[PDB]
Amino acid sequence: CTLSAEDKAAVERSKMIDRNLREDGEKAAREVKLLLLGAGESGKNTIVKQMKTGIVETHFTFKDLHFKMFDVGAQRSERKKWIHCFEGVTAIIFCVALSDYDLVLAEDEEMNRMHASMKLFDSICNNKWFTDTSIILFLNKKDLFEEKIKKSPLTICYPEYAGSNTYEEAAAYIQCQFEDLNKRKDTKEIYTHFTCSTDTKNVQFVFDAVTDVIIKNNLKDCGLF
Amino acid sequence: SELDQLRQEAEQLKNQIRDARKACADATLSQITNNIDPVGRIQMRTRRTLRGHLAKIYAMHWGTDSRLLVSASQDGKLIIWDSYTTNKVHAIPLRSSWVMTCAYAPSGNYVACGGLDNICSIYNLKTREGNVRVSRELAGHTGYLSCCRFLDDNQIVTSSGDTTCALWDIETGQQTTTFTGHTGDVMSLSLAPDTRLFVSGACDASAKLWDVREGMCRQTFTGHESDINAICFFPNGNAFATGSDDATCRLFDLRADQELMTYSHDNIICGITSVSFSKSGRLLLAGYDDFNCNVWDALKADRAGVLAGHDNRVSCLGVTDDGMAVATGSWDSFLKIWN
Amino acid sequence: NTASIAQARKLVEQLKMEANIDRIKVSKAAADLMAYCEAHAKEDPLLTPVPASENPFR
Amino acid sequence: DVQLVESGGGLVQPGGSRKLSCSASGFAFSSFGMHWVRQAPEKGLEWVAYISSGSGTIYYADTVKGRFTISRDDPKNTLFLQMTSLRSEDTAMYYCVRSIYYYGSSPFDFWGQGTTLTVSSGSDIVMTQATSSVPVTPGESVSISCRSSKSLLHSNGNTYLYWFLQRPGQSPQLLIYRMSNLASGVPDRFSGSGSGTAFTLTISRLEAEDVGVYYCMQHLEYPLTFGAGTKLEL
Amino acid sequence: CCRIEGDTISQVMPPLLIVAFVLGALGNGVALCGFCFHMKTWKPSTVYLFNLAVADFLLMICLPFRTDYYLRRRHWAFGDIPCRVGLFTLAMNRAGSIVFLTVVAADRYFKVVHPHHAVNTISTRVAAGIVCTLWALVILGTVYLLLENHLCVQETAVSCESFIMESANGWHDIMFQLEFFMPLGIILFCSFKIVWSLRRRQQLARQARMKKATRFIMVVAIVFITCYLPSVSARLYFLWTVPSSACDPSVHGALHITLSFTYMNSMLDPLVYYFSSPSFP
């Protein structure tokens, strides 16, 4: 209607482009977007090789579910200017080393790597863009932490800690201290897993947390959340 | 200590600059402009709604033919739009889907984009093969690339989040000129009409005027209280306007080297993502985080109109080179054309 | 920590050239912007809307 | 490089059936609409059939409609012209033509070399060229005029006039695609102009490289009709 | 053809029908306005919920004529064809309401128990095809009511009734029993699986929002049972004693009362499906 032959053919080309865009969007909607975070090179690499310079794309499939895990390491800038790009991710995978409770960051004087991880977790968890985004917290290097906690007590890291110098009690205390940074407990869930250097069931934990997040999403659609 | 002496000398130089600005200011833009007629109420209607993006649209750019568009969204798709007919001329799949800027060449031959991959990718639109392929990928920025602007088919200035602006040679792919001096991450970029100078707004609440052919900062403009996210020259190239997170737009002059007028309202508290000027420069269009664009009397600091109709944050703005239409992009995956 | 002296010298050199810049009065710049706005006011389709026959987005 | 190679031509008895193939290489065959254009030994270009990208739109000339079949297979970049009930007027050299359609595109830009097939023994836009053969001195400007029965200027401002030059023993190439727009790879000494139904093509500083037959084609509406062809000699 | 003079019936049917009509009309009209206008993107779950609301509203449409029939001491003064249309629309919207409750429950089951299934990724166009096919099947199964004469004349008193007709209306009774019992089984199994899986997830079940979601998953089944069991049970009691209960006043009155609870279910559907969701604008 009031179109030339070239106009009609351009409209047909636009409709084909729309069709391919719809197919690409439907392909990308079934993918799981995960934001990988952590304080420096603590446990990101071991986790990455367990499932599998700007942003790093890690693609892996588990139980017929494709995962898109994004590493924002070596993006040394203001986080708030690009952290809204990951507002629609399924979950945040936060990697924390357990063995750096007594190490120093060496960038600031009298700075603890553990407390830097706590501050980064407090900023990420209570961020305005991640109000309803669940966090899969990974506590890296449990065996190294277990064998070094005998030599170095955790009280040099947490002065208010008064428990025994055992792996289980101090690990639970560290997990509780990280979960206490969540001020939005009524609207988001934090999943904590303790992972060794060579631990096979890390992917299954990520799949279970992502499945819980996906259940929370589907229930909204049904108008029942 | 030489360091304390140089800090004292820098403080003295800053005080001298501030005193030279204060002594040179006699009558503000309001005091001279309050005696002319206002623009009235500027009402614009959504003429076209460009659908097809499926994620938050982060950037746009108009063609110099004032008909062709390019838009970037987190789909990983650069869609080129025929705005007259709402037709998709091209859809460019991106290697990195975290795109935060896009530019369209003045000749119309090329499209650039960039983002969290720290790479400005040049796309050859008019190829012999009939597809849009990557001309080259410009690498060298250590931070996220926040804005890019074509000077010609071979020159491009790219803003980035490594507190550094950069001028590139697309024939060689090499770092021709590096612009340094910003403290925070540089978030916006705007070329002069003659492409002799350009301004950049960064996260240090500062705007700097650079020269392309000498590669060093001429003037530094301050006054904002938060992160500058938008910047745009006045159409004669002798002034520019900024937009930041403190809900204020400031107009700066290159010759006076001062802030002339603040475009702020009490009912506006959210940040400003995009800032664009009309063809005459009388209207200043600013996209905000409260989901709509507010047209400002650029000479009188009066809200000339509100461009409401986006369900999410208006992230990018653009006025055509003939001034005929303004296009607003937003995080709700829609582009709207206004007249 | 001796490398900060070069950065301080570069900063004070930038401030020294930025201070030695000829500045016209803000009234003159305001009048220039006002004259540019008035000279191109009729050729501004957003400020002065064109009829629907001349509007390509009709 | 972009190349279109035709195959399947040959001597055919009347009433027979033959299938033409057009192998495409060097370009994105899927995104291009594809045309069949034949030229009888009387030296006249005639459009035959068209298939769009995605095979969603198919057009035929009134003399081959319901008797010819055009199809494409995008996986292997081949264009097909299934011909049945071949008669003597189908004796022509069939060109496989490449054309893309968007804003600012240049359709009919690449033509294939052509395959020769031999058969033994009203509402259309008439495109008219007054001069069929004129002599020209090299280095001097020449003008080729074309006329149309219907105005080729559309409501969108496009005048759908195409200029083709076919050198002796060569496939036609596009020079001007919408009444003024110079094609890619053709010199700036070719210029097109006109308005409505009257058209002209100016070749300033003519060389022996410009010797051939010049055709004007309309793309306002199907079927696409060519001119008779103006040949430049000397 | 009988003469069951009713007085207790005409005192309590007009109030129940008036309340059901007004409440369901407002509720379903507002729910349809919210689904149509104030939602920018539709999903298959929204399509199923919208069609459930459409069935409930279409059932609200023809309640006023039933009410006017009941105030006139069960006298139908509208003609034969209108009686066919009214009975057909009542039956068709009841069957559509039941079918779309079942489809909503099966959706939720696949959304909660098999989250990563290909069924959850179907386009909304496939959802529209499914709901149109289900509407077609419901219309085909209910269309008989348009082919018969439902008016019974009794001393110049015309009564347009379907269940009280006789010992058996044909397969109608079989279709009336199954259209509750098969969806009852499907809804019970889906709801129990959903609640079981949700409570298995230790970390997800801790939230108050998940507790409210599980509570409403239970409440919808409770409402369906408590609104569709009385009529089915009364029909069974009448069929089992058909010779003794033929033209029985008590049974007839109880059956007429207990069919009002299906309209009450369609009236309560917006309260538990739309006005209860914290995410529906």
- Read off the CATH number of the domain in which E63 is found: 1.20.1070.10
Q: Residue type for B81, please?
A: W
Contact C26 B235 (CB under 8 A): no
User: Do the Cβ atoms of B192 and B175 come closer than 8 Å?
Assistant: no
E224 touches chain A (CB under 8 A): no
Is there a domain that residue E278 lies in?
no
Tell which E residues from 83 to 142 touch A, by Cβ distance under 8 Å.
104, 107-108, 111-112, 115-116, 120-121, 123
Nearest CA in chain C to B7: C8
- State whether D43 and D112 are in the same domain: yes
Candidates B315, B321, B322, D18; CA nearest to B336 is: B315
User: Do the Cβ atoms of B120 and B113 come closer than 8 Å?
Assistant: yes
- State whether D82 and D142 are in the same domain: no
State this model's resolution in angstroms. Answer: 2.8
Candidates D77, E43, B50; CA nearest to A17 is: B50
Contacts of A8 in chain B (CB under 8 A): none
Nearest CA in chain A to D31: A13
Is there a domain that residue E62 lies in?
yes
Query: Contact partners of B by the rule of 3+ C-beta pairs under 8 A?
Result: A, C, D
User: Do the Cβ atoms of B79 and B88 come closer than 8 Å?
Assistant: yes
Angle made by CA atoms B223, B229, B234, in degrees to the nearest 5: 70
Determine the Cα–Cα distance for residues A205 and A199; give it in Å rounded to an integer: 11
| Least CB–CB distance from A215: residue in E121, E204, E209 | E204
Number of B/D CB contacts below 8 angstroms equals: 27
Which domain covers residue D211, as residue numbers? Answer: 133-232
Residue B46: CATH number of its domain: 2.130.10.10
DSSP per-residue string spanning E52-116: HHHHHHHHHHTHHHHHHHHHTTS---S-HHHHHHHHHHHHHHHHHHHHHHHHHHHHHHHHHTSTT
| Least CB–CB distance from B130: residue in D1, D100, D103 | D100
Give the residues across from B252 on adjacent strands. B240, B259
- State whether D47 and D140 are in the same domain: no
- State whether D49 and D82 are in the same domain: yes
- State whether D140 and D176 are in the same domain: yes
Cβ of E14: how many Cβ atoms within 10 Å? 17
Cβ of E148: how many Cβ atoms within 10 Å? 15
Which domain covers residue E23, as residue numbers? Answer: 8-273
Number of domains in chain D: 2
- State whether D154 and D190 are in the same domain: yes
Omega prior to C45 cis, within 30 of 0: no
Which domain covers residue B289, as residue numbers? Answer: 3-338
- DSSP character for A161? -
Determine the Cα–Cα distance for residues D4 and D114; give it in Å rounded to an integer: 9
Sheet containing D68-73: order of strands? D3-7, D18-25, D78-83, D68-73
Contact A17 B88 (CB under 8 A): yes
- State whether D105 and D198 are in the same domain: no
C2 φ, ψ (degrees, to nearest 5): -80, -10
Contacts of B144 in chain A (CB under 8 A): 54, 75, 77, 81-82
Number of domains in chain B: 1
Q: Give the rounded distance of the alpha carbon of B248 from its chain centre.
A: 15
Contact E204 A224 (CB under 8 A): no
C47 touches chain B (CB under 8 A): yes
Number of domains in chain E: 1
Contact A6 D33 (CB under 8 A): no
- Six-digit token string for B23: 């002594």
What is the 3 state secondary structure string of B64-78?
Answer: CCCCEEEEEECCCEE
| Least CB–CB distance from E280: residue in A189, A218, A223 | A223
Gap from B47 CA to chain A (nearest CA, Å): 18
- State whether D50 and D138 are in the same domain: no
Contacts of C7 in chain B (CB under 8 A): none
Determine the Cα–Cα distance for residues E192 and B309; give it in Å rounded to an integer: 44
Is there a domain that residue E106 lies in?
yes
Contact A78 B185 (CB under 8 A): yes
B279 φ, ψ (degrees, to nearest 5): -70, -45
Determine the Cα–Cα distance for residues D63 and B137; give it in Å rounded to an integer: 51
Determine the Cα–Cα distance for residues B231 and B203; give it in Å rounded to an integer: 12
Q: Residue type for A44, please?
A: K
What is the three-class DSSP state of B4? helix
Determine the Cα–Cα distance for residues D181 and D17; give it in Å rounded to an integer: 40
Q: Give the rounded distance of the alpha carbon of D47 from its chain centre.
A: 7
Which residues lie closer than 8 Å to E105 by C-beta, 6 or more apart? E186, E187, E190, E191, E220
- Six-digit token string for E242: 């058909």
Q: Give the rounded distance of the alpha carbon of E192 from its chain centre.
A: 21
Contact B279 C18 (CB under 8 A): no
User: Do the Cβ atoms of D78 and D22 come closer than 8 Å?
Assistant: yes
Give the residues across from B303 on adjacent strands. B296
E strands in chain E: 151-153, 158-160
| Least CB–CB distance from A54: residue in B55, B85, B118 | B118
B246 φ, ψ (degrees, to nearest 5): -95, 15
Gap from E167 CA to chain A (nearest CA, Å): 41
**Are 3 or more Cβ–Cβ pairs between A and B shorter than 8 Å?**
yes
Omega prior to D223 cis, within 30 of 0: yes
User: Do the Cβ atoms of A54 and B125 come closer than 8 Å?
Assistant: no
Q: Which of D67, D88, D119 is the last residue of a domain?
A: D119
User: Do the Cβ atoms of E7 and E250 come closer than 8 Å?
Assistant: no
Candidates B73, E177, C12; CA nearest to B81 is: B73
Determine the Cα–Cα distance for residues E235 and E272; give it in Å rounded to an integer: 27
Sheet containing B120-124: order of strands? B99-104, B110-115, B120-124, B133-138
- Six-digit token string for B26: 């006699």
Residue boundaries of the structural domains of chain C? 3-58
Contact C56 B324 (CB under 8 A): yes
A49-52 long-range Cβ contacts below 8 angstroms, 24+ apart? A50/A195, A50/A199, A50/A200, A50/A202, A50/A203, A51/A202, A51/A203, A51/A206
Contact D160 A10 (CB under 8 A): no
N-to-C CA span, chain D: 32
Give the residues across from B249 on adjacent strands. B243, B263
Contacts of A88 in chain B (CB under 8 A): 55
Q: Best residue in B88, B146, B185, B187 to probe A by mutation, most A CBs within 10 Å?
A: B88
Gap from B155 CA to chain D (nearest CA, Å): 23
Alpha helices in chain D (DSSP H): none
Contacts of A5 in chain D (CB under 8 A): 160, 219-222
Determine the Cα–Cα distance for residues D178 and D157; give it in Å rounded to an integer: 10
Determine the Cα–Cα distance for residues C19 and B14; give it in Å rounded to an integer: 8
Distances (CA, A) of B312 to A90, D144, E36: 20, 57, 20
Residue in this structure with the two tokens 């008909």, named with its chain if needed: B67
Gap from B89 CA to chain D (nearest CA, Å): 6
Gap from A71 CA to chain D (nearest CA, Å): 35
| Least CB–CB distance from B117: residue in A14, A17, A54 | A54
- DSSP character for D181? -
